[PDB]
């Protein structure tokens, strides 16, 4: 059964499932996550789609940073009350999330052997860097720096794993103007990490 | 009367004018050679075989001619207008089954203009600028930003647009732009007591009037030009 | 059976299987494609090898763009009469394409839920960007911008899926000269997409 | 059994397993390799961690290049006496290398059909390029050019496959100073190749 | 005595001073509005609902106010000090259950300074430099490197630091830096017989006294400024 | 006669000259210290243990000496010739089983030149250029492009090569290059009636005579230098 090798938000949820900005009173964006167990690694496939107007108005500025922060317990279940994503991940049922309980979700987690908590001599191994793109209204691709940070902090004793994705741009012009701004969509970003034992 | 080789293929006029945009993708339809046959239709001479005879700036193999339909397209070699503004293209239509003989036919000229995109960022032809400003001086056009843009002199891809980045918030100055010279004439609308021994240092940002092309947007990182004006 | 999880052109076909340039009277290049079903994603692995002289002479110019455009029907079978690649894809038999019919080829296709046809509000999600390289004769790597576009248009009612790969460079010198130009080979490019249901 | 689809050095070995620099009298760094059989491809996941002081002092210079060179015999077994990595690869046992013999290790190897030995007309297909990062002490990411070279040379008749990874930077400042230099760790690098038959 | 709407919410002072670093991440805690209620605790008027009334440079939506706690944070719009050095922020505390009426309350002003990071690489305001050097000339401060840095004039992110890249190994010259003008005053500590008709060409590297920010480190690729001095 | 410690290890000459290319990869074979033993072969004193005593520009740890064979290689620290043109290397051969005593031995000097690669793009030392051209003026060498290249003054990695990018298609001008000064002397081979009040604006591209190195090719994006000449 290959549907149990994926842990992911669904393809295009009907409502926003993530609250990036703290000023937002409710969920303001759709976070698309995918985690695929490829051998001893996890292939992670992430992007965001803006829903709220104040999230979509970020394309009118030239210095933007925002952050999806995800916390997971000892079984790998998402801590939605502390995470940006407010809907728990699940397995594959076609284009949608499955419904039941999670089996071996802990194996999807970043490995604490490779990515330890609170080790100053080994902090450099917690970092992943990359680039995604924002297509403008005139089909201009603007590069976006992505910093993925694995197992950085535990907010409480419940948190056992941590994934912090940070998108940012520092551009010479705003990618859009106030009239032409429609929706902040980032091109997908694929990174890898060594996964925890099942 | 048969469909013998008895005439030359017929054009509609000797001069065809097409036009294509700079940096267009491959297989972009530039134009069409609208020809016709004076013989009977559905015949061998009606099967017109167009043929590009000559490019005058022949070195880049830019255009492609669909020999069956006469549609002229762009190729994988990308057009750059700032090295070749326009192209001239001698083509001929040929009757028969594609036999190549030295028999004369009717051949036409094609003029293809290349339409400019704003693919060049304006740069300043001057580096240090400084002016002397006194009191009861107003509407004073003392200094002018030299700029240089390569995009088709006279067009809106070439006309400089200026904004203040820092230094002028009180409203001391204001930029007009000269189009015959592409010049950032910056003015003086608020007077300074010259005796104050003050500074009015500022820095500007240079860009074209039209928005940049999608190839060079996201690559445009303007560094503010630091004009220091002493009063 | 892990040979049915790959849909791909073969490794080094004996003759050219793709016609990139429209001026070419026959196939002018070898297109190497690989599609691997990794969970709910497809890992796609593409490059080109020049065969014809007029395709290989592109390395003597500093502004190049070319495009492999692929159309697929409702079952995921390639429409060779409309696509750049003129040989249908097949499964794995060692280093070669298999011979029989395709099983669950539709699952290799980009998902119309994630990548819809003709939706102006969601067009930005159809775009993938990246970089490959061209090694010169003096072992200089020239960067090549790649734009992958998923489910953009249907030429007819037969087309149900669409993958447009576009390579381009805009360099300050020609990577080769007329004597030193041997063969246009691009470094491989790996991208991901959310796949259609099987 | 999905543990046999990975060939890899272990996660954080207790001692250094690789000798990058020739001036080193013993192993001076930990090389982390991972090879995952994804369909007809291998996903390769590599980075280095500095152990010795003379390997870690490279961060105090602005022009660095170093090379992990790996040679494999006809069965895919690593030739440790010729390779930079002095410990043979093995399968997955949790976060550690397994112990027994290798099964179908030859399938993890780069394909000699796609990547042939000593063909001048097809040398350009042996090249992979990419970028990893070095996080500085002030959390500055410095880009590192990576050149992966597949099946370039055989030192003897025993060598049947070859993977040369070369990291280098040419920066405008040294990433560290002599006091602030702690450990040279590169961000992980993922590349793909067409794999040999099993 | 009930917890009626009988007063205005109480501030500790009319002027609050906070401070935040340039290019800070989102949800960075800038400051806190320490207010109090003169009424009974655990009451409706004790539930203070803070509210940002006005930014004076209102156009970028930079700050966020936690209306329950009064903690002021940064947002996803990243701060750039070199366009706005500081911010002024009129806020008001409101009692009740969040009812919005035109009843006056006590409202305070907030001043937020933006702390500068070294996010700008210094560039030279002069391009060609050349001096004449004679014999029995020593401790001679003949030429000065113009530089320009945008990072908060007077700070160590703005003060130029100079090193020789090539040309001066004998120890002919030595750079001092003027701070009132940000000037690379390069000296002459080893004499040259001017009759020798020699050359002392060299090239320098310009950088700030403080280390560059982590955003622009790894993007700093200095090109050596080629100062040619003829003796 | 035994193989006692009775002599000093024998060199072939006191001065060894090697040579290595700039930006060479690690473990690139620079040279070899060809020494010999005056004692019996296959002996302890025959086991020569070479040892690098001193680098004179000792700060970068560039070279490695195989103490068994005497082969000198490059290390992971990459050579840059434009900071250190050559190196001097005092080494000594030692007999015995690697015992380190203060007993004198025969020690030699090694001179290693670094061979230059074209790793620097030439840049113009002048920014604005303009000349006055009259009629019956031909073969006129009125203006000269200042350039600056760092790659080993006198070499072909340093000699400027010029091409016209735009402006001169009629064949008005022609660039010669001065090698003693590295100067783009541009000429005048087609006369202009000065009374015409015309313009002959053009733009050139500067590059070295030799092709650029593979490190900086694909990073070379020339911006055309806009020389405006008024007639």
* CA distances from residue F189 to D75, D77, F227 in whole angstroms, order as listed: 71, 70, 17
Asked, for residue B4, whether it belongs to a domain, the answer is no
Q: What is the rounded CA–CA span in Å between residue D52 and residue D70? A: 21
Are E166 and E93 contained in the same domain? no
Q: What is the rounded CA–CA span in Å between residue A181 and residue A177? A: 6
Asked, for residue E5, whether it belongs to a domain, the answer is no
* Residue F9 main-chain phi, psi, to 5 deg: -65, 145
Cβ atoms within 10 A of the Cβ of D15, count?
Answer: 9
For residue A55, the SS3 value is helix
Burial-class residue B26 by CB neighbours within 10 Å (0-12, 13-18, 19+). Answer: buried
* CA distances from residue B22 to A89, A129, B212, F168 in whole angstroms, order as listed: 48, 36, 13, 22
Question: Is the Cβ pair E148, B223 closer than 8 Å?
Answer: no
Q: What is the rounded CA–CA span in Å between residue E162 and residue E145? A: 10
Q: Which two tokens stand for residue F223?
A: 């911006």
Q: What is the rounded CA–CA span in Å between residue C62 and residue F220? A: 12
Q: Residue F40 belongs to what domain range?
A: 10-115
* Residue to substitute from C50, C133, C137, interface D, most D β-carbons within 10 A: C133
* Residue B112 main-chain phi, psi, to 5 deg: -120, 115
Q: What is the rounded CA–CA span in Å between residue D62 and residue D68? A: 20
Are E156 and E200 contained in the same domain? yes
Are F101 and F159 contained in the same domain? no
Q: What is the rounded CA–CA span in Å between residue F219 and residue E171? A: 35
Q: What is the rounded CA–CA span in Å between residue B65 and residue B50? A: 8
**Looking at B66, B97, B115, which one is the last position of a domain?**
B115
Strand partners, B86: B113
Considering only CB atoms, A114 lies closest to which of D2, D11, D135, namely: D11
Q: What CATH number does the domain containing B215 carry?
A: 2.60.40.60
Report the 3 state secondary structure along B174-202: CEEEECCCCEEEECCCCCCCHHHCCECCE
> Based on C-alpha coordinates, what's the Rg of chain A?
17
Q: What is the rounded CA–CA span in Å between residue B97 and residue B34? A: 19
Q: What is the rounded CA–CA span in Å between residue F43 and residue F2? A: 9
Which strands sit side by side in the sheet containing C141-150, from one edge to the other? C63-72, C161-170, C141-150, C127-135
Is residue D89 within 8 A of residue D109, CB to CB? The reply is no
Are F129 and F209 contained in the same domain? yes
* CA distances from residue A185 to A14, A53, A63, A132 in whole angstroms, order as listed: 16, 13, 16, 10
* Residue A107 main-chain phi, psi, to 5 deg: -70, -15
H or E element at residue E162: strand E160-166
List E residues 3-32 in contact with A (Cβ-Cβ < 8 A): 23, 25-27
Alpha helices (H) along F81-197: none
H or E element at residue C56: helix C53-56
H or E element at residue C150: strand C141-150
β strands within chain B, DSSP E: 10-11, 15-21, 29-32, 35-36, 49-55, 63-65, 71-74, 86-94, 107-115, 143-146, 160-166, 175-178, 183-186, 202-208, 225-227
Q: Which residues contact A1 (CB under 8 A, 6 or more apart)?
A: none
Q: Which two tokens stand for residue A154?
A: 């535990």
H or E element at residue D54: helix D53-56
Task: For tokens 């051209």, name the residue.
Answer: F133
Q: What is the rounded CA–CA span in Å between residue D190 and residue C38? A: 15
Q: What is the rounded CA–CA span in Å between residue A52 and residue A15? A: 11
Is residue E157 within 8 A of residue E150, CB to CB? The reply is no
Considering only CB atoms, E220 lies closest to which of D139, D143, D173, namely: D173
H or E element at residue D55: helix D53-56
Question: Is the Cβ pair C140, F214 closer than 8 Å?
Answer: yes
Task: For tokens 């961060």, name the residue.
Answer: D59
* Residue A54 main-chain phi, psi, to 5 deg: -75, -20
Asked, for residue E45, whether it belongs to a domain, the answer is yes
* Residue E195 main-chain phi, psi, to 5 deg: -65, -15
Question: Do the bridges between strand E160-166 and strand E35-36 make them parallel or antiparallel, or are there none, so unpaired?
Answer: unpaired
Q: Structural domain tally of chain E?
A: 2
Question: Is the Cβ pair C61, B77 closer than 8 Å?
Answer: yes
Chain B hits for F166, CB-CB cut-off 8 Å, are: 82-83, 150
For residue D193, the SS3 value is strand
Chain E residues contacting B, CB < 8 Å? 82-83, 123, 125-127, 148, 150
For residue E196, the SS3 value is helix
Question: Is the Cβ pair F218, C139 closer than 8 Å?
Answer: no
Q: What is the rounded CA–CA span in Å between residue E162 and residue F34? A: 44
Q: What is the rounded CA–CA span in Å between residue A134 and residue A129? A: 17
Q: What is the rounded CA–CA span in Å between residue C122 and residue A50? A: 11
Are B129 and B76 contained in the same domain? no
Considering only CB atoms, C63 lies closest to which of B27, B64, B80, namely: B80
β strands within A12-72, DSSP E: 29-38, 41-50, 63-72
Burial-class residue F10 by CB neighbours within 10 Å (0-12, 13-18, 19+). Answer: middle
Q: What is the rounded CA–CA span in Å between residue C152 and residue D73? A: 47
> Based on C-alpha coordinates, what's the Rg of chain F?
28
Q: Which two tokens stand for residue B33?
A: 């050679």
Cβ atoms within 10 A of the Cβ of A127, count?
Answer: 20
* CA distances from residue F90 to F51, F93, F98 in whole angstroms, order as listed: 9, 11, 18
Task: For tokens 């020339």, name the residue.
Answer: F222
Is residue D190 within 8 A of residue D47, CB to CB? The reply is no
**Looking at E68, E97, E115, which one is the last position of a domain?**
E115
Is residue B78 within 8 A of residue C145, CB to CB? The reply is no
CA distance C64 to chain D (A): 19
Q: What is the rounded CA–CA span in Å between residue C82 and residue C69? A: 8
Asked, for residue E171, whether it belongs to a domain, the answer is yes
Task: For tokens 């995952």, name the residue.
Answer: D36
Which strands sit side by side in the sheet containing B29-32, from one edge to the other? B29-32, B71-74, B63-65
Are F97 and F43 contained in the same domain? yes
Q: What is the rounded CA–CA span in Å between residue F141 and residue A89? A: 75
Is residue E149 within 8 A of residue E125, CB to CB? The reply is no
Question: Is the Cβ pair E75, A61 closer than 8 Å?
Answer: no
* Residue to substitute from D1, D111, D124, D131, interface C, most C β-carbons within 10 A: D124
Residue B105's nearest CA partner among B6, B1, B2, B4 is B6
Q: Which residues contact B118 (CB under 8 A, 6 or more apart)?
A: B151, B156, B157, B208, B210, B211, B212, B213, B216
Between the CA atoms of E18, E23, E26 and E27, what dihedral angle is there, to the nearest 10 degrees?
A: -20
Between the CA atoms of B214, B217, B218 and B222, what dihedral angle is there, to the nearest 10 degrees?
A: 180
Is residue E195 within 8 A of residue E212, CB to CB? The reply is no
Strand partners, C49: C30, C185
DSSP code string of B154-166: TSTTTSEEEEEEE
The count of residues in chain E is 231
Q: What is the rounded CA–CA span in Å between residue D120 and residue D50? A: 36
CA F152 to mean position of chain CA atoms:
5
Residue F202's nearest CA partner among A98, B36, B148, D106 is B148
Q: Which two tokens stand for residue F187?
A: 């000429």
Task: For tokens 């002289």, name the residue.
Answer: C53
DSSP code string of D143-158: EEEEEEEES---SSSS
Report the 3 state secondary structure along F136-194: CCCCCCCEEEECECCCCCCCCCCCEEEEEEECCCCCCCCEEEECCCCEEEECCCCCCCH
Residue of chain E whose Cα is closest to the Cα of D140: E214
Q: What is the rounded CA–CA span in Å between residue A73 and residue A153? A: 13
Is residue B208 within 8 A of residue B153, CB to CB? The reply is no
Asked, for residue B5, whether it belongs to a domain, the answer is no
Q: What is the rounded CA–CA span in Å between residue F174 and residue F141? A: 9
Q: What is the rounded CA–CA span in Å between residue F97 and residue F40? A: 15
Q: Which residues contact B186 (CB under 8 A, 6 or more apart)?
A: B141, B143, B144, B145, B162, B173, B174, B175, B176, B204, B227
Q: What is the rounded CA–CA span in Å between residue C60 and residue D29? A: 43
Alpha helices (H) along chain E: none
Residue-wise burial string across E94-111, b where 16 or more C-beta atoms lie within 10 A, e elsewhere: bbbeeeeeeeeeebbbbe
Q: Please report all neighbours of E, defined by 3+ CB atom pairs within 8 A.
A: A, B, D, F
* Residue E17 main-chain phi, psi, to 5 deg: -115, 115
Report the 3 state secondary structure along A116-178: CCCCHHHHHHHEEEEEEEEECCCCCEEEEEEEEEECCCCCCCCCCEEEEEEEEEECCCCCCCC
The CA-CA-CA angle for residues E216, E217, E223, to 5°, reads: 95
Q: Which two tokens stand for residue B158?
A: 């070439």
Are B70 and B134 contained in the same domain? no
* CA distances from residue D66 to A129, B62, B143, D166, F20 in whole angstroms, order as listed: 21, 44, 54, 6, 18
Q: What is the rounded CA–CA span in Å between residue F186 and residue D29? A: 56
Question: Do the bridges between strand C41-50 and strand C189-194 make them parallel or antiparallel, or are there none, so unpaired?
Answer: antiparallel
DSSP code string of chain D: --GGGEEE--SS-SS--B---TT-SS--EEEEEEEEEETTEEEEEEEEEE-SHHHHGGGG-SEEEEEEEEEE-TTS-B-TTTSSB-S--B-EETTEE--S--SSGGGGSBPTTTS-SS-GGGGGGGEEEEEEEEE-TTSPEEEEEEEEEES---SSSS--EEEEEEEEEE-SS-SS-TTT----BPPPEEEEEEBPP-
CA distance A139 to chain E (A): 23
Q: Which residues contact F203 (CB under 8 A, 6 or more apart)?
A: B150, F164, F165, F166, F167, F224, F225, F226, F227
Interchain contact F/A (3 or more Cβ pairs less than 8 Å): no
Is residue D43 within 8 A of residue A42, CB to CB? The reply is no
Specify the long-range contacts of residues B52-57, CB closer than 8 Å, at least 24 apart: B52/B89, B52/B90, B52/B91, B53/B90, B53/B91, B53/B92, B53/B107, B54/B89, B54/B90, B55/B87, B55/B88, B55/B89, B56/B87, B56/B88, B56/B89, B56/B90, B57/B84, B57/B87
For residue D126, the SS3 value is helix
Considering only CB atoms, B166 lies closest to which of E83, E127, E148, namely: E83
For residue C34, the SS3 value is strand
Q: Which two tokens stand for residue D60?
A: 């105090």
Asked, for residue E132, whether it belongs to a domain, the answer is yes
Specify the long-range contacts of residues C143-149, CB closer than 8 Å, at least 24 apart: C143/C169, C143/F218, C144/C168, C144/C169, C144/C186, C144/C187, C145/C169, C145/C170, C146/C189, C147/A141, C148/C44, C148/C191
Task: For tokens 């001097």, name the residue.
Answer: F88
Question: Is the Cβ pair C138, F218 closer than 8 Å?
Answer: no
CA distance F58 to chain C (A): 32
> Based on C-alpha coordinates, what's the Rg of chain E?
28
Are E166 and E111 contained in the same domain? no
β strands within A51-116, DSSP E: 63-72, 92-93, 96-97
Chain B hits for C58, CB-CB cut-off 8 Å, are: 76-77
Chain A hits for B221, CB-CB cut-off 8 Å, are: 171-172
Is residue A33 within 8 A of residue A45, CB to CB? The reply is yes
Looking at residue E44, the DSSP 8-state letter turns out to be: T
Question: Is the Cβ pair F214, C142 closer than 8 Å?
Answer: no
Asked, for residue B3, whether it belongs to a domain, the answer is no
Question: Do the bridges between strand B107-115 and strand B86-94 make them parallel or antiparallel, or are there none, so unpaired?
Answer: antiparallel
Question: Is the Cβ pair B222, A172 closer than 8 Å?
Answer: yes
**Looking at F61, F88, F115, which one is the last position of a domain?**
F115
Burial-class residue A72 by CB neighbours within 10 Å (0-12, 13-18, 19+). Answer: buried
Are F15 and F107 contained in the same domain? yes
CA distance F72 to chain E (A): 27
Q: What is the rounded CA–CA span in Å between residue E62 and residue E27? A: 10
Question: Do the bridges between strand E107-115 and strand E15-21 make them parallel or antiparallel, or are there none, so unpaired?
Answer: parallel
- Contact E214/D at CB under 8 A: yes
Are B135 and B43 contained in the same domain? no
Are E108 and E147 contained in the same domain? no
Q: Which residues contact A157 (CB under 8 A, 6 or more apart)?
A: none
Are B160 and B86 contained in the same domain? no
Q: What is the rounded CA–CA span in Å between residue F179 and residue D90? A: 61
Chain F hits for B150, CB-CB cut-off 8 Å, are: 166, 203, 224
Question: Is the Cβ pair E83, B128 closer than 8 Å?
Answer: no
Q: What is the rounded CA–CA span in Å between residue C148 and residue B211? A: 25
Asked, for residue F2, whether it belongs to a domain, the answer is no
Q: What is the rounded CA–CA span in Å between residue C172 and residue F220? A: 6
Q: Which two tokens stand for residue A56?
A: 């979509």
Give me the sign of the Cα torsion angle B9, B10, B16, B20.
Answer: negative
Chain C hits for B27, CB-CB cut-off 8 Å, are: 22, 67
Q: Which residues contact E166 (CB under 8 A, 6 or more apart)?
A: E202, E203, E224, F82, F83, F150
Q: What is the rounded CA–CA span in Å between residue E64 and residue C108? A: 45
């Amino acid at each position: 059964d290959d549907n149990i090798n994926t842990l992911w938000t669904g393809v295009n949820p009907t409502t926003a499932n993530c609250q990036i900005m703290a000023s937002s009173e409710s969920n303001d964006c759709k976070l698309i996550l995918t985690l695929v167990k490829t051998g001893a690694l996890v292939t992670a496939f992430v992007y965001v789609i803006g829903v709220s107007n104040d999230f979509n108005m970020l394309t009118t500025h030239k210095n933007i940073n925002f952050t999806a922060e995800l916390f997971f317990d000892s079984t790998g279940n998402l801590l939605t009350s502390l995470s940006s994503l407010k809907t728990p991940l699940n397995h594959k049922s076609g284009q949608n999330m499955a419904t039941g309980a999670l089996t071996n979700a802990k194996g999807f987690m970043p490995s604490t052997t490779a990515y330890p908590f609170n080790v100053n001599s080994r902090e450099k191994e917690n970092y992943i860097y990359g680039t995604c793109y924002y297509t403008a209204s005139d089909h201009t691709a603007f590069p976006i720096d992505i910093s993925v940070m694995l197992n950085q902090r535990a907010l409480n004793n419940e948190t056992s794993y941590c994934i912090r994705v940070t998108w940012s741009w520092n551009t010479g012009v705003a990618p859009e103007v106030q009239t032409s701004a429609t929706t902040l969509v980032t091109s997908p970003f694929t990174f890898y990490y060594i996964r925890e034992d099942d | 009367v048969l469909d013998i080789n008895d005439n030359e293929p017929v054009f509609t006029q000797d001069v065809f004018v097409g036009s294509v945009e700079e940096l267009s993708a491959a297989h972009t339809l530039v134009m069409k050679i609208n020809a016709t046959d004076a013989d009977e239709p559905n015949t061998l001479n009606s099967k017109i075989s167009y043929r590009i005879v000559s490019l005058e700036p022949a070195y880049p193999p830019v255009f492609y001619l669909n020999k069956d339909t006469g549609e002229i397209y762009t190729t994988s070699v990308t057009l750059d207008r700032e090295e070749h503004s326009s192209y001239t293209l001698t083509v001929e239509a040929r009757d028969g089954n594609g036999e190549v003989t030295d028999k004369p036919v009717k051949q036409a000229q094609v003029q293809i203009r290349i339409l400019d995109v704003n693919d060049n960022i304006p740069v300043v032809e001057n580096k240090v600028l400084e002016g002397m400003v006194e009191e009861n001086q107003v509407n004073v056009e003392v200094t002018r930003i030299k700029v240089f843009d390569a995009d088709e002199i006279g067009s809106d891809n070439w006309l400089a647009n200026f904004t203040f980045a820092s230094g002028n918030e009180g409203g001391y100055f204001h930029i007009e732009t000269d189009a015959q010279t592409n010049e950032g004439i910056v003015t003086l609308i608020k007077e300074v007591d010259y005796e104050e021994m003050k500074n009015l240092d500022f820095s500007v940002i240079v860009a074209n009037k039209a928005a940049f092309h999608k190839s060079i947007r996201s690559k445009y990182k303007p560094t503010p030009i630091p004009i220091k004006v002493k009063v």
